[PDB]
Structure formats: C-alpha cells, structure tokens
Amino acid sequence: IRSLILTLDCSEAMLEKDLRPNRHAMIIQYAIDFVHEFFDQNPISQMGIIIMRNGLAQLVSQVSGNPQDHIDALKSIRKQEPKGNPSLQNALEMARGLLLPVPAHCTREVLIVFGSLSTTDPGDIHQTIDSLVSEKIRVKVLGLSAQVAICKELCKATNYGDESFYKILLDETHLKELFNEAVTPXXXXXXXXXXXXXXXXXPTRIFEDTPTFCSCHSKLVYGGYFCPNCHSKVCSLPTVCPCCDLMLILXXXXXXXXXXXXXXKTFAEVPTTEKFRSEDCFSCQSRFPXXXXXXXXXXXXXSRYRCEDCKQEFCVDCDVFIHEILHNCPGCESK
Amino acid sequence: SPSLLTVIIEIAPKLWTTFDEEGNEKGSIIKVLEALIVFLNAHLAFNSANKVAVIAAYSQGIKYLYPXXXXXXXXXXXXXXXXXXXXXYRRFRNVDETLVEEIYKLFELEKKQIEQNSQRSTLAGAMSAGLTYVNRISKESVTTSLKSRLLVLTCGSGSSKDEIFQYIPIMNCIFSATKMKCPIDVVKIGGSKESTFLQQTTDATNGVYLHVESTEGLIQYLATAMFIDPXXXXXXXXXXXXXXXXXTSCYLTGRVVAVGFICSVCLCVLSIIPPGNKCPACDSQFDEHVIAKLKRK
C-alpha cells in the first residue's frame, strides 16, 4: 500500500557529538527500530534505504517488503564512518527512480533524516522539487536543530502547499516520536481521483518438506505458501507472488485495514460527584480514587471515565490500553 | 513462577437446550462447571501464588464470575455447598462460592427479554476485557512476571453465535493478543461444527484448539489443555490440525474467495466478479481503466 524511501544523512556533519555517542549510530539504531515498527504496522508495504555519503546518493536497500534486507543494510552502515557531504538532489532523483515503477494507486513517500545544516547538490534543487510535485511524491524531512529554507519549501510544496511536515528534532526522544509518526499513515484531503486494484491471491499453507521445494530460489524449505494462480510453492510472505504477480495476503490485510479503521473514541472524564455511580471499570475492576490531591475536596471527587456509546465506566489505564490495541470498549459489544 | 489463567465461560441458554435435547441429557452445564472447578483447583495446586480469573459472557452482557468482584461489591456468608465441607484451600472454596452465587444471579436475570436478546455473541467483550484484565493485573504485579494465557470455553449454540458482526472484533482480539504474547487456548464446546475464525485465533496466537462435539468427557479435554496452558511450551504442542484457511471471506456476497480486490484505498473485502460501480462497499468513484482491464481478463 505504502512505499517509503528512507534517506539517511551520512556525512561528516554526522560525526559530531550531539546524540550519544554520535548522531550516526543513533540514527541507524532508531532506523532499525523504525523498520521493525513500520513492517509491524504495515505488512504489505515497501521500503527502500538510500544513504547520502561522499557527496553521492547510494542505494543500500532495494525496494522490497522483507525487513531482513533492510536490517542487514542498516547494519552495514554503522561499520563505516559517515564521510563526505549530503546530496538532497541525488537522493530525490534516485528516490524518483525507485518510486516511478510503483503503481499510481500506491502512495509514494520519501522520509529524509537530515542532520546537516547544508547540502551539496549538482543542479538546481527547485527543478527536482517541481518534478516531485508533478509526479505526486510526498516528502517528509526530519531536520536537526536549525531549520533550512529548502526543507521548508520542499515539505510545504510536496504536501498540497501545506507546511506541517518539516519536523525539527531536538533530542533522541523527539527523533523517536517522529519515527513513530512515520509508521502511521496520513489520510490527507487528497485531490479526489479514482482508486481500485484487482487480483489478490490468498495462499494455502504447505507443510510438506520430505523432498522440499522452492519456485523463487530453488532451495530447501520446511514448508511454503501456495499460489492460487500459477500454483507455485515459494517462500512465505503476504506480499506479491513472484511467479505471476499477485498478492498472497491473509488476515494481515484485515489487521492493517481495521487498524486504519479504528476511530479511537476517547472516553469522557466525568467526576464521581456528577455521575452518581460507584467507582467501577468494565474492562477490569477499579475501586481506586483518581483524584486525592487535597483533603475531602479532591478525595471525595475522583474521576470516572465514560463511554457514551454504551454509557459505561472505565479507568484511565484501560482507556489508554484500548487506545493502543484492541477494539474500543467491551461494552459496545453488549446491547 | 506464578501463572495467571483467564478462563472465559460462554453462558447461553441455547447451549443448555441443545445439550438437553440432542441425545437426551448428555450432562448439564453445572457438571461442566464442576469439572471446570476441579481443573481450577488443579491449576491452583500446580504452583504456589497462582492466580485465576473466571469471566462469564451472558447473552444480555458479560459479567465476572469471580475476579474479586463480589468482594468489591460487598466492600462498598456461604451457600451451604458440599465442596465447602470438602475443605482444603480457603481461596478455592471462596472461588466456588462466587461461582455458584453469580450463576444463581444469571438464573435471576433470565426472562423472555433475555431470550429476545439472544441474537449476538458477547465473546468479543469478554476477550477484550480479558486482555485488558491481564494487562492491568500484569502492571499491578510488576514484582515477578506472570505467565499469562487466556482460555476461551467457546459454547457454540443456536440463534446467531457466529456472524460477521463478531468476526472483526475477534480478529482485533487475536492481533492484540498476538502483541501481548498471550496464547488463546480455545475449547469449542458444542455440536459438530468448527469456526474458521477460531482456527485463526488458535493458529494466530500460537495456542491450542480442542473441538468438543456433544459432551463426552469433560476433565479429559480440561486436562489435555490444562497441562499445555501454563507451561513455557517446551514441546511442539498437539492441536487439532486441518485449520489451514484463507483467513478472508467476501462480505458483500457471502462466499469464500481465492482472489480479490482492495476496496478503493478503503481496503475492504470484495469478489473479483462484481462489476465495481463505486466500489460496492462504500461510495467512491471506481477507476474506469482498471475495470476496462478487468472485463477483458
């Protein structure tokens, strides 16, 4: 569904001592964690890692849905020293070369981790910006410390003229938060066009391994997925079958679809003196006063959470928990 | 190591009717609750400091069969049971008292309006409240981690206990249960019928599925699951094989499908053959080029 291109800054400016021990190692590690979370909340999505080193853009992880390739590609960067200077234009041109074969019904995202305060580009970057906006490519830049006007014009131009995507990071925790923000999709207002895709297989799991089989690598396996079209037994991933080009999805597509469908209804905070109901939680059992800062003014007040779709009481930890995972409110299942 | 056991009981009068009609009386639900009581005492005697949690799911709503709920209601007495005279473990006999008292309350709640409210399945709320329960008590018992696993005694009866209105929240409960790393051991008490979404539950949460047709032996299945549940899984486990399904189903038509379409960045489920006029699941302009390529293939 999504096609994100992770462009990490790997130049001499990354050798400075801001993060611990340096910016490069923390960006690599947090990039590995970003690969984990991204492939955990986006199963049938694509990733591609490019680095900006030695004044050039170097593709280190081809566009694929297997996280292990990105993990190894990120492990190879921390064993070398980030030298040279960053090149935004070359990275955006190569990102274009990786996002052009992507179908129009799939989003094209480019996430740039920019630590330096200056880039080294051959040609005019504004023409590359015009090319990015023309072919519809959403660009998000996580810059370090001071702002760059080119990043403002790029993030604003690549998002329907709206500026709210050039995120400034000031610490490791902030960078973690931005990473987390790139996991979640962005249902923007769009420009109203047509959408649909067709042909998505569902596999049958083969447990046989006495003679083994493989139609994508011709190697030994312990069992493999079955294509309902070309009838090939390949390595197991819910992505595209490489023998006739169609998906092999299962309950994962339903999972991410329902995750994108979650309304996440925050329960209204109503004091016990206003609800006139005993302290109760419907997901567990709560006899704990929430408020008690003062004497009888706060202890006898407390806070009861309310789901209005069923008029039920809950405590805060369960509102947070059902906001993180699970469908909202067990009381909405009983009528 | 202390192990937590969240056993969910599907209380439905239709299950009582099916078990008291097909083949005379094959044993009422009270006997299954007594063998379940023996299983609970076995789990309590498995290791010290082991906690239990019995949750009920009545047709009119779910209600905790124990989790210190009656004690919390009385904080804001015996039923003259023979198991109380059996002595041994005061906590166990108190759990039995809470069970029989809550069951008697379920008897007091039953009427014709409850029969009119018997068209859904209150299992999603019990599974969500169960995962939230083990998470709340897991955070409260931070000292020495707990071996948390949830057993679902799915009572498949008549009316409409399995429908498309409950498949989505169950899938949310098995994805969230997968994130919680707590296996869901499903025991399908009922007739000779199997639900594909329950096979997705046991195969998705790395649990076990015990299909129980009619009644047969109780502590048989209760024991075969009982030795599996609290262990750290040193074996390869022995569930009921043949649970390989496509994990998807067309909602607009009602048939299991091999290939399909994405709705239209709506990402729903639909069949190949339907025309597609404004992605038939929601109103949004269908791509004329893609349908032009579809009608040819």
Binding site: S118, I125, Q147, A149, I150, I168 | -
Partner: protein
C-alpha cells in the same frame, strides 16, 4: 579559510570603492546563495554605501555580526569645525559625536534584523560601550561569546518550536 571551504562556499565582500553593478551582483549572489541552501558571509561597512532595508525572508542573514561599535573618522578639520560649531550651539561637546552618530550607524544594522514578528533573528554587538547607548527593544543580556554559541544553538530550535505553538 575553512568557513569558505565548508559552510559558506563563497564570501561576499563590499569593495572599499563600492560599485553599483558589483553590489547588485553581490546582493543577487546573496539571494541565490541563500536560496540554494549555501549561505555567504557579507563583509560590509556601516559607513559604506547601500544601507539596505529589504528583509521579511530567510534569504537575509538570520544572524548578524557587528565588529565592535561604529566609529567616525576623527583628526579631520571638518569634525573640528562642526565640533566647535555645535559646541557653541548646544554645548554638546565631546559626547554626542561618539554616541549619536555611532548609535545611528549601529541602528542601521539593528533595523535589518527586525523584519516582522513572524520572523526571528539574532544580532551580536561587541564592546561594553554599547551599554552606554540605547537600542530598539531594550531587552539585552550581556554574556560571553562562547556561551552565546550554545545559546544561539538553542535559539535556532526554540525559534522553530514556538512558531506553531503560538499560532
């Protein structure tokens, strides 16, 4: 010369004998250099030509550096003639010609930093004698330069954080 070789790419110097086309090419070179993500140091004189006044953009110097305080060329017969003339007029001898003129020349550099409340900036004034004169928006803190490096390093992020928070 590492500043020209690493961060500035090129330096902009106003000739002691200013030229119209040279200054125009230096200003256009400044706008294009700042519009390419490069930047350039503009070594100019407050007493020289072109006092500027066009800002309201990030193309202008976000940080402005002042070498001490402005000074007027003394040891001239004109400064002594007007010195004794104004001495006979308003009796402001040896006091206003080294603070009023320098105050105006420094204010010509202070006016380039201010360009609306939506924009930000920082102007570093050297010498303690600046405390003897007033300034636009009299809110100034006196500290070292090495500390001002980290202080500005934090201001370059606070100025970028408070924008969407105050909007």
């Amino acid at each position: 010369m590492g500043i020209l070789d690493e961060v500035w790419k090129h330096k902009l110097i106003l000739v002691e004998t200013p030229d119209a086309q040279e200054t125009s090419l230096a200003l256009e070179t400044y706008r294009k250099a700042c519009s390419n993500g490069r930047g350039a140091i503009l070594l100019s004189v407050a007493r020289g030509k072109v006092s500027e006044g066009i800002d309201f953009d990030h193309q202008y110097g976000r940080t402005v550096l002042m070498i001490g305080i402005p000074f007027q060329y003394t040891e001239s017969r004109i400064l002594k003639a007007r010195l004794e003339f104004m001495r006979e007029n308003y009796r402001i001898r040896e006091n206003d010609f080294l603070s009023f003129d320098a105050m105006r020349h420094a204010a010509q550099c202070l006016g380039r930093v201010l360009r609306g409340k939506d924009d930000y900036g920082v102007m570093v004034l050297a010498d303690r004698r600046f405390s003897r004169k007033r300034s636009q928006l009299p809110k100034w803190i006196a500290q070292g330069l090495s500390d001002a490096d980290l202080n500005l390093s934090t201001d370059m992020a606070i100025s970028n954080t408070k924008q969407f928070l105050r909007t």
